Amino acid sequence: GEFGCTMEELRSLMELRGTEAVVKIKETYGDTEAICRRLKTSPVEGLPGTAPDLEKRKQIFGQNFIPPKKPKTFLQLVWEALQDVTLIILEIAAIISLGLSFYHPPEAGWIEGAAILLSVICVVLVTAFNDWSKEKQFRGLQSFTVVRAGQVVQIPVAEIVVGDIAQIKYGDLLPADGLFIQGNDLKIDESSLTGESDQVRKSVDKDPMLLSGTHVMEGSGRMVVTAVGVNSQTGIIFTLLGKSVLQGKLTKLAVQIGKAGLVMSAITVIILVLYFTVDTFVVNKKPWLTECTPVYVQYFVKFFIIGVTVLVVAVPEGLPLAVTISLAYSVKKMMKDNNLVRHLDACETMGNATAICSDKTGTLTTNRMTVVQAYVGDVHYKEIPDPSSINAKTLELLVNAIAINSAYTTKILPPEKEGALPRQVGNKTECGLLGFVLDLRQDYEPVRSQMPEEKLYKVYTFNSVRKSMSTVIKMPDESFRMYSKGASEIVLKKCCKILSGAGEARVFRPRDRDEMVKKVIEPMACDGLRTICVAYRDFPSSPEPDWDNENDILNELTCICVVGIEDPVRPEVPEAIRKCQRAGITVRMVTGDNINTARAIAIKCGIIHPGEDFLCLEGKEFNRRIRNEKGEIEQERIDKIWPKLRVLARSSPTDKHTLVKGIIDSTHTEQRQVVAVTGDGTNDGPALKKADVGFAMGIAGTDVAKEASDIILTDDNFSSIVKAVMWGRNVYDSISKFLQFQLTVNVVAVIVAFTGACITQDSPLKAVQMLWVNLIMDTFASLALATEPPTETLLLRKPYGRNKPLISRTMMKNILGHAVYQLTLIFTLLFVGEKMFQIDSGRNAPLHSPPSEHYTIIFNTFVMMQLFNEINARKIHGERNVFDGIFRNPIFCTIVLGTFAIQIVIVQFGGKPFSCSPLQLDQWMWCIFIGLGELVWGQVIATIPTS
Amino acid sequence: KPRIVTSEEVIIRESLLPVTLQCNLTSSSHTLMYSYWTRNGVELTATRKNASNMEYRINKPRAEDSGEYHCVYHFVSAPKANATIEVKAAPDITGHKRSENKNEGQDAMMYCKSVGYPHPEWIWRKKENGVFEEISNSSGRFFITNKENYTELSIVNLQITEDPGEYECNATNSIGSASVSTVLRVRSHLAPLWPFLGILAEIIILVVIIVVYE
Ligand SMILES: *[C@@H]1O[C@H](CO)[C@@H](O)[C@H](O)[C@H]1NC(C)=O
Ligand SMILES: *[C@@H]1O[C@H](CO)[C@@H](O)[C@H](O)[C@H]1NC(C)=O
Ligand SMILES: *[C@@H]1O[C@H](CO)[C@@H](O)[C@H](O)[C@H]1NC(C)=O
Ligand SMILES: *[C@@H]1O[C@H](CO)[C@@H](O)[C@H](O)[C@H]1NC(C)=O
Ligand SMILES: *[C@@H]1O[C@H](CO)[C@@H](O)[C@H](O)[C@H]1NC(C)=O
Ligand SMILES: *[C@@H]1O[C@H](CO)[C@@H](O)[C@H](O)[C@H]1NC(C)=O
Ligand code: BEF
Ligand SMILES: [Mg+2]
């Protein structure tokens, strides 16, 4: 009826690897050869002819082409930036003000609405442009044979269909998933997909699982394609992929401020209505039958308009622009620490992170097999020594043995791309010895060049029973030289003598000499190392022994060198983890590798300490314990594991996603958690999307891991995650400094407006003056407080949390204390100010009079107190010295002096448009005196203990 | 000579009743060309018609309307006959100066304007104690330059000891009188010094609290 449908769903050999693969293959189907007979293909000359109908019928499996994502246009980014909780409300207020400005039932309003709309447009444009530029910067950084009809021919990748019989050689990149037919000991590297650092051996029975995106490192074979399109293991994860923590706090603060402003407006309207009702209805006692119909409703509408006017004053309009410019500046500064931030809203999250989940292979380790410690000449060096430590011909012998024994196809080349680690194209474990030789500052190339393959006499190859590959030649002299390297015990059992010391080759005694070498080798394997030893043999010149005889040639070996091979930790990782743990962060490792290697690297990195206080699990037993008898992920079961879990080994991407989700969603702890995830591989794709912050390695990371992440480490340095913590705690401070300065302007302004509308009939602070104070001057004030350099003492506090309010208790104390002083001074200048200054009182004006000197003094004093409060707003804790580190920031001084000069110009030459009258010299020094009294009042406020 | 019979003089009081002024050309043997009303030598707008008998009506009579009116008669080949209807009202001070703030040793000027005919005589009286006494020229620094309406008082080389006070400007005509007051302020030369001594008296406080606390 229907041909065999997509493999990943109908015969799910994929996603189930290991020895269990053939377990299902044998019971369901034949011997991986009848599976080809099930399809319209054969292991030999399969897919007999092109037959476009057949090709299109097979293309129902897939296209072998994943469409790239479509970059978003600037207008699309603007449209996305428009839809905000705060920005919608501000536009509503602006439109209300503009509409009610023109209501004159048979200047003001034209100013507030335009200012609000301009600030909103600036916010939208800045955010959209920054996202566009960052994404455009990111896009720049990132980046075969088949048996068609009898004769093998090169074919484009996109035309590969299910059933193709492909010939794969060393150095190739697998285009699609498939099964294994036949080959000669294929060894492949699946570190980017599976996470396993060890090279996997693909055989017909042990594990015939071929995955797309893995690099075949040695061997050649024949495969049949099974998963072509997005149905491959990489494509599934790719298709599975597609508000910040700070924005929630900002919107909660916004709604609280809005409710406060609404209460103030309601109070003023009630006061006005009660005054009218009491005055008119009691004394005059109007008939209240028909005369009130127009007059009373027009009066009530006027009072409602006055209340709406008071409501707008309370709302802070420069807050979004200040936050946006502070975030943009911090992102630009962070980019110089090799952190590429993409959305401009992720620059703050890492400051308050409480946990980190880290991949092992590629993230904490270098993913390169290197020799770390070596035992040569009865001297054991825990670190690689200098080239002339022993300075004997034994080093020349070692270099020659390594170069000639193996180095035919395995070579080490320069990266050919500036800013990357050296690249290897051969067997990874073999080039560890070549790396040892190169790091001994000796060149293996001359030794390899002088001996071509024709001149090699005999080359015994590593196989199942031999297990120790060897190379024996004769050219350099009349005698024979044989070199053999391999496993520690396997080759040690065949070492009759040992080249000991810098002198003469001694003999190897299994009774007494073996004890010392065992005592040297056992701690090596104890520390997770793999021990490989090298030996040499000589054959008599006359006669020539039978080389086919493997009995004598295998034995009688002189051991020369013993090395320790490992996948080492990155040099900066231990101290970076040590610094993050002091800042209140908990580091956990999630890896797809084994449990022993994971535990060893966790001990070296410092994640866990001996004692087994914490717990380490595997992928299978974590799934079984996390599920109830029904078979559903229960949040109550996860809360028993994640508090104490430190190492998770052999974990699928689904396991990492489940762990991160369980940590984020749990409410078992005292404080809610913020989780960041670091990675470099495709199996980290899901976990990097669920996390609040995702860090991706830049040079080593794959495309899937780099796309799903928010921050990219452009030099894959683990110590640049610590600078993401300290730049995220500096962002949160520079935003709480601006809240302290801005929220004391709004209280004073709203109370002055309420008093001038209710009690008096005009306010000393006009419309354009407050436009200058709130729009232009406060934006530059927020630009000044953002540029305070960070310091390494930020990394001593604990993370705050998701639900901690922005306005702390000290900030409340500062706001109230400064508002009290400002209000007292303003009211004293308003009501008794003309007797002190000996001028004409300008309290009541006929609206057809020039600006008064009584009111310009109040405006100037208000601006001066704001200017001198920009200095007190630098210490959000109880610090007494507000001048500490003032000169480290020249932008602050420049902005303050520029604001003072512009205020002088505005007052002197403003005129009627600014409602300002020129002032004398003695009348200006009193304004500076009253403004400078703010600093002296700051100390009186700071004396009061907030506890 | 043509004969013109004019209405009686009218005194503008606070009543809102309109006032009409009349001239009747009872005898004229010349061919009349046109006629018009004039106030203080200035022709009133839209008063030129045939008007063998012309009327001018004031709907809201005020002190600014009062003046020396004429109804001029221009003939084809005869000299003009003007006549006179005088409208008298009490003086009403239109503009003045609320206050004059000046520093020591400069010139201070204060002015008052009035309207209405007859043109009032001006008396300046400084408020000495609780009464308005006339100012004294006992130092040669007071200049009173009074014109038909404008009246200016100038003081040279202002002294803080005596000059500051209130100065009253009086306008009196046959009917009524009105007055306004102006306050003159003389500022000391060392005025900017006192705030300066207070600015650095709190800088010392700031650099003692911080440095003791270290
Ligand atoms: C007004 O018209 C009459 C009748 O024609 C004439 O006698 C008299 O001169 C005119 N007066 C003018 C034009 O001023
Ligand atoms: C004055 O002129 C008016 C307007 O023509 C006339 O009604 C009135 O009778 C005249 N009076 C005399 C006394 O001639
Ligand atoms: C009319 O002429 C007389 C001649 O005595 C003169 O006094 C008077 O000012 C003139 N009127 C006008 C308005 O010019
Ligand atoms: C006051 O006396 C001076 C003497 O120089 C003179 O110039 C001035 O006009 C006098 N002022 C008055 C009002 O008489
Ligand atoms: C004062 O009188 C002059 C001259 O007649 C006149 O131009 C001016 O308008 C008058 N000022 C006022 C305020 O009436
Ligand atoms: C102005 O001068 C007159 C005449 O000397 C005097 O009676 C009067 O009190 C003064 N003030 C006013 C307001 O008329
Ligand atoms: F690459 Be990791 F070990 F999953
Ligand atoms: Mg990895």
Short mmCIF file of all heavy atoms in Angstrom, two decimals, chain A residues 246 323 326-331 334 344-349 351-352 724-738 785-786 788 790 794 797 876:
data_model
loop_
_atom_site.label_atom_id
_atom_site.label_comp_id
_atom_site.label_asym_id
_atom_site.label_seq_id
_atom_site.Cartn_x
_atom_site.Cartn_y
_atom_site.Cartn_z
N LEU A 246 14.80 41.59 34.12
CA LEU A 246 14.78 43.01 34.47
C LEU A 246 13.46 43.67 34.08
O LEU A 246 12.96 44.54 34.81
CB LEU A 246 15.95 43.74 33.81
CG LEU A 246 16.10 45.22 34.16
CD1 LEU A 246 16.42 45.41 35.64
CD2 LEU A 246 17.15 45.87 33.29
N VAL A 323 16.92 53.95 30.72
CA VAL A 323 17.27 52.53 30.79
C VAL A 323 17.87 52.06 29.47
O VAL A 323 18.86 51.32 29.45
CB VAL A 323 16.04 51.70 31.19
CG1 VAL A 323 16.38 50.22 31.19
CG2 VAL A 323 15.53 52.12 32.55
N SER A 326 21.47 53.47 29.05
CA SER A 326 22.37 52.78 29.97
C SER A 326 22.69 51.37 29.48
O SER A 326 23.86 50.95 29.49
CB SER A 326 21.77 52.75 31.37
OG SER A 326 22.43 51.80 32.18
N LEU A 327 21.67 50.64 29.04
CA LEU A 327 21.89 49.29 28.52
C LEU A 327 22.77 49.31 27.28
O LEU A 327 23.64 48.44 27.11
CB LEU A 327 20.55 48.62 28.24
CG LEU A 327 19.98 47.69 29.30
CD1 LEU A 327 20.01 48.33 30.68
CD2 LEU A 327 18.56 47.30 28.94
N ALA A 328 22.54 50.27 26.38
CA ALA A 328 23.35 50.34 25.16
C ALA A 328 24.81 50.63 25.48
O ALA A 328 25.72 50.00 24.91
CB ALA A 328 22.79 51.41 24.22
N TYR A 329 25.07 51.57 26.39
CA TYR A 329 26.44 51.86 26.78
C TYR A 329 27.11 50.65 27.41
O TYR A 329 28.26 50.33 27.10
CB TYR A 329 26.47 53.04 27.75
CG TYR A 329 27.86 53.39 28.25
CD1 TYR A 329 28.76 54.08 27.45
CD2 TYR A 329 28.27 53.02 29.53
CE1 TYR A 329 30.02 54.39 27.91
CE2 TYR A 329 29.53 53.33 29.99
CZ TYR A 329 30.40 54.02 29.17
OH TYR A 329 31.66 54.33 29.63
N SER A 330 26.39 49.94 28.28
CA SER A 330 26.97 48.77 28.93
C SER A 330 27.24 47.65 27.93
O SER A 330 28.24 46.94 28.06
CB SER A 330 26.06 48.28 30.04
OG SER A 330 25.76 49.33 30.94
N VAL A 331 26.37 47.47 26.94
CA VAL A 331 26.61 46.46 25.91
C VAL A 331 27.86 46.81 25.12
O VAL A 331 28.70 45.94 24.82
CB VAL A 331 25.38 46.32 25.01
CG1 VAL A 331 25.76 45.68 23.68
CG2 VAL A 331 24.31 45.50 25.70
N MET A 334 30.82 46.01 27.22
CA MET A 334 31.01 44.58 27.40
C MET A 334 31.58 43.93 26.15
O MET A 334 32.26 42.90 26.24
CB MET A 334 29.69 43.91 27.77
CG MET A 334 29.62 43.49 29.22
SD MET A 334 28.05 42.72 29.65
CE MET A 334 28.07 41.33 28.53
N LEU A 344 20.34 43.06 23.79
CA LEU A 344 20.43 44.28 24.60
C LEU A 344 19.63 44.18 25.90
O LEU A 344 19.78 45.02 26.79
CB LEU A 344 19.98 45.51 23.78
CG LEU A 344 19.89 46.89 24.43
CD1 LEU A 344 20.69 47.91 23.65
CD2 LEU A 344 18.45 47.34 24.56
N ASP A 345 18.83 43.13 26.04
CA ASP A 345 18.12 42.89 27.29
C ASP A 345 18.74 41.75 28.09
O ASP A 345 18.28 41.47 29.21
CB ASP A 345 16.64 42.60 27.03
CG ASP A 345 16.42 41.57 25.94
OD1 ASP A 345 16.82 40.40 26.13
OD2 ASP A 345 15.85 41.92 24.89
N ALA A 346 19.76 41.09 27.56
CA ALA A 346 20.46 40.02 28.24
C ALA A 346 21.71 40.49 28.97
O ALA A 346 22.38 39.68 29.61
CB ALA A 346 20.84 38.92 27.24
N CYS A 347 22.04 41.78 28.90
CA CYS A 347 23.26 42.28 29.52
C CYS A 347 23.15 42.34 31.04
O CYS A 347 24.18 42.48 31.71
CB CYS A 347 23.63 43.65 28.97
SG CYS A 347 22.34 44.90 29.14
N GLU A 348 21.94 42.26 31.59
CA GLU A 348 21.75 42.37 33.03
C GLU A 348 21.54 41.03 33.72
O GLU A 348 21.82 40.92 34.92
CB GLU A 348 20.55 43.28 33.33
CG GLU A 348 20.43 43.71 34.78
CD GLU A 348 19.60 42.76 35.62
OE1 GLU A 348 18.79 42.01 35.04
OE2 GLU A 348 19.76 42.76 36.86
N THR A 349 21.06 40.01 33.01
CA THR A 349 20.60 38.79 33.66
C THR A 349 21.72 38.10 34.43
O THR A 349 21.54 37.71 35.59
CB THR A 349 19.99 37.83 32.64
OG1 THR A 349 19.20 38.56 31.70
CG2 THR A 349 19.12 36.81 33.33
N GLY A 351 24.13 39.11 35.99
CA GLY A 351 24.46 39.71 37.27
C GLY A 351 23.75 39.04 38.43
O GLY A 351 24.32 38.94 39.52
N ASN A 352 22.52 38.58 38.22
CA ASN A 352 21.72 38.01 39.30
C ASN A 352 21.53 36.50 39.15
O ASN A 352 20.62 35.94 39.76
CB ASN A 352 20.36 38.71 39.37
CG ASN A 352 20.46 40.09 39.98
OD1 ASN A 352 20.91 40.26 41.11
ND2 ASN A 352 20.04 41.10 39.23
N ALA A 724 31.11 39.00 32.72
CA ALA A 724 29.69 39.17 32.44
C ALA A 724 28.88 39.27 33.73
O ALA A 724 27.82 39.91 33.73
CB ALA A 724 29.17 38.01 31.59
N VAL A 725 29.35 38.66 34.81
CA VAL A 725 28.69 38.81 36.10
C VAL A 725 28.91 40.22 36.65
O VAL A 725 27.97 40.85 37.14
CB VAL A 725 29.20 37.75 37.09
CG1 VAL A 725 28.48 37.87 38.42
CG2 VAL A 725 29.02 36.36 36.52
N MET A 726 30.14 40.72 36.58
CA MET A 726 30.45 42.03 37.15
C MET A 726 29.93 43.18 36.30
O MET A 726 29.69 44.27 36.84
CB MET A 726 31.96 42.16 37.36
CG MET A 726 32.71 42.83 36.24
SD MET A 726 34.22 43.64 36.81
CE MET A 726 34.68 44.56 35.35
N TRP A 727 29.75 42.99 34.99
CA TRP A 727 29.08 44.00 34.18
C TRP A 727 27.57 43.92 34.29
O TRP A 727 26.89 44.88 33.93
CB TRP A 727 29.49 43.86 32.72
CG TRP A 727 30.74 44.60 32.37
CD1 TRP A 727 31.96 44.06 32.09
CD2 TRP A 727 30.89 46.02 32.24
NE1 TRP A 727 32.86 45.05 31.80
CE2 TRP A 727 32.23 46.27 31.89
CE3 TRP A 727 30.02 47.10 32.40
CZ2 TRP A 727 32.72 47.55 31.70
CZ3 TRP A 727 30.51 48.37 32.20
CH2 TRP A 727 31.85 48.59 31.85
N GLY A 728 27.02 42.80 34.77
CA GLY A 728 25.60 42.72 35.02
C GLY A 728 25.17 43.25 36.37
O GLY A 728 24.01 43.62 36.54
N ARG A 729 26.09 43.29 37.33
CA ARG A 729 25.84 43.92 38.62
C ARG A 729 26.11 45.41 38.60
O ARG A 729 25.59 46.14 39.44
CB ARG A 729 26.68 43.25 39.70
CG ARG A 729 26.41 41.78 39.85
CD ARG A 729 27.08 41.19 41.06
NE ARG A 729 26.72 39.79 41.22
CZ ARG A 729 27.13 39.01 42.21
NH1 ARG A 729 27.91 39.48 43.17
NH2 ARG A 729 26.75 37.74 42.24
N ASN A 730 26.94 45.88 37.66
CA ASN A 730 27.13 47.31 37.46
C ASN A 730 25.95 47.93 36.72
O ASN A 730 25.62 49.09 36.96
CB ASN A 730 28.43 47.56 36.70
CG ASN A 730 28.80 49.02 36.65
OD1 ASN A 730 29.04 49.58 35.58
ND2 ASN A 730 28.85 49.66 37.81
N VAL A 731 25.32 47.17 35.81
CA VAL A 731 24.14 47.66 35.12
C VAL A 731 23.00 47.87 36.10
O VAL A 731 22.28 48.87 36.05
CB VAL A 731 23.74 46.69 33.99
CG1 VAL A 731 22.24 46.76 33.73
CG2 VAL A 731 24.50 46.99 32.75
N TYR A 732 22.81 46.91 37.01
CA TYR A 732 21.71 46.99 37.96
C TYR A 732 21.91 48.14 38.94
O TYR A 732 20.93 48.72 39.42
CB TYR A 732 21.57 45.66 38.70
CG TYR A 732 20.45 45.58 39.70
CD1 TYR A 732 19.18 45.18 39.31
CD2 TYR A 732 20.66 45.88 41.04
CE1 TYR A 732 18.15 45.10 40.22
CE2 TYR A 732 19.63 45.79 41.95
CZ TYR A 732 18.38 45.40 41.54
OH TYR A 732 17.35 45.32 42.45
N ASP A 733 23.17 48.47 39.25
CA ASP A 733 23.44 49.59 40.15
C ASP A 733 23.21 50.93 39.45
O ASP A 733 22.63 51.84 40.03
CB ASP A 733 24.86 49.52 40.68
CG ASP A 733 25.03 48.46 41.74
OD1 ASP A 733 24.03 47.77 42.06
OD2 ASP A 733 26.15 48.31 42.26
N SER A 734 23.67 51.07 38.21
CA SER A 734 23.52 52.33 37.51
C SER A 734 22.07 52.63 37.15
O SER A 734 21.76 53.78 36.82
CB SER A 734 24.38 52.35 36.24
OG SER A 734 23.82 51.54 35.23
N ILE A 735 21.20 51.64 37.21
CA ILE A 735 19.77 51.87 37.02
C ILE A 735 19.09 52.25 38.34
O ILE A 735 18.16 53.05 38.34
CB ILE A 735 19.11 50.64 36.38
CG1 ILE A 735 19.56 50.49 34.93
CG2 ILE A 735 17.59 50.73 36.45
CD1 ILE A 735 18.96 49.30 34.23
N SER A 736 19.56 51.71 39.47
CA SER A 736 19.02 52.10 40.76
C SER A 736 19.56 53.43 41.26
O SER A 736 19.00 53.99 42.20
CB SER A 736 19.28 51.01 41.80
OG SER A 736 20.62 50.56 41.75
N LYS A 737 20.65 53.93 40.67
CA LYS A 737 21.08 55.30 40.97
C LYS A 737 20.17 56.31 40.28
O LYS A 737 19.89 57.37 40.84
CB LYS A 737 22.53 55.52 40.53
CG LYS A 737 23.56 54.69 41.27
CD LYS A 737 24.94 54.93 40.68
CE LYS A 737 25.88 53.77 40.97
NZ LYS A 737 25.95 53.45 42.41
N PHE A 738 19.72 56.00 39.07
CA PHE A 738 18.83 56.90 38.36
C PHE A 738 17.43 56.91 38.95
O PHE A 738 16.74 57.93 38.89
CB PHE A 738 18.76 56.54 36.88
CG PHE A 738 17.80 57.38 36.09
CD1 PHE A 738 18.09 58.69 35.80
CD2 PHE A 738 16.60 56.85 35.65
CE1 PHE A 738 17.21 59.47 35.07
CE2 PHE A 738 15.72 57.62 34.93
CZ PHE A 738 16.03 58.93 34.64
N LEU A 785 25.44 58.93 35.18
CA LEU A 785 25.52 57.89 36.20
C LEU A 785 25.76 56.51 35.63
O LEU A 785 26.15 55.60 36.38
CB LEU A 785 24.23 57.88 37.04
CG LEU A 785 23.96 59.13 37.87
CD1 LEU A 785 22.47 59.35 38.06
CD2 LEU A 785 24.66 59.04 39.21
N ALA A 786 25.55 56.32 34.33
CA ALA A 786 25.76 55.01 33.72
C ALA A 786 27.24 54.71 33.53
O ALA A 786 27.64 53.54 33.59
CB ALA A 786 25.03 54.93 32.38
N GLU A 788 29.90 55.02 35.25
CA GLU A 788 30.78 54.76 36.38
C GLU A 788 31.47 53.42 36.20
O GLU A 788 30.79 52.39 36.05
CB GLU A 788 30.00 54.79 37.69
CG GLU A 788 29.54 56.18 38.09
CD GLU A 788 28.65 56.17 39.32
OE1 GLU A 788 29.12 55.73 40.39
OE2 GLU A 788 27.49 56.60 39.21
N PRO A 790 33.11 49.79 36.53
CA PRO A 790 32.90 48.71 37.50
C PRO A 790 34.18 48.38 38.25
O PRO A 790 35.29 48.71 37.83
CB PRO A 790 32.46 47.53 36.63
CG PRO A 790 33.11 47.79 35.32
CD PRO A 790 33.13 49.29 35.15
N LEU A 794 32.33 44.21 43.39
CA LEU A 794 30.95 43.81 43.11
C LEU A 794 30.76 42.31 43.25
O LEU A 794 29.64 41.86 43.50
CB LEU A 794 30.55 44.25 41.71
CG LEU A 794 30.29 45.74 41.48
CD1 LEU A 794 30.14 46.03 40.01
CD2 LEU A 794 29.05 46.17 42.24
N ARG A 797 29.04 40.33 46.77
CA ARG A 797 27.64 40.26 47.18
C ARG A 797 27.00 38.97 46.68
O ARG A 797 27.54 38.26 45.83
CB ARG A 797 26.87 41.47 46.66
CG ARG A 797 27.74 42.65 46.32
CD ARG A 797 26.94 43.75 45.65
NE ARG A 797 25.99 43.23 44.67
CZ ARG A 797 25.39 43.98 43.75
NH1 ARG A 797 25.64 45.27 43.64
NH2 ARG A 797 24.53 43.40 42.92
N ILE A 876 24.14 54.42 46.40
CA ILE A 876 22.84 53.83 46.71
C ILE A 876 22.84 53.03 48.00
O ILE A 876 21.77 52.58 48.44
CB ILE A 876 22.34 52.95 45.55
CG1 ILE A 876 23.43 51.98 45.11
CG2 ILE A 876 21.89 53.81 44.39
CD1 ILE A 876 23.15 51.32 43.79
#
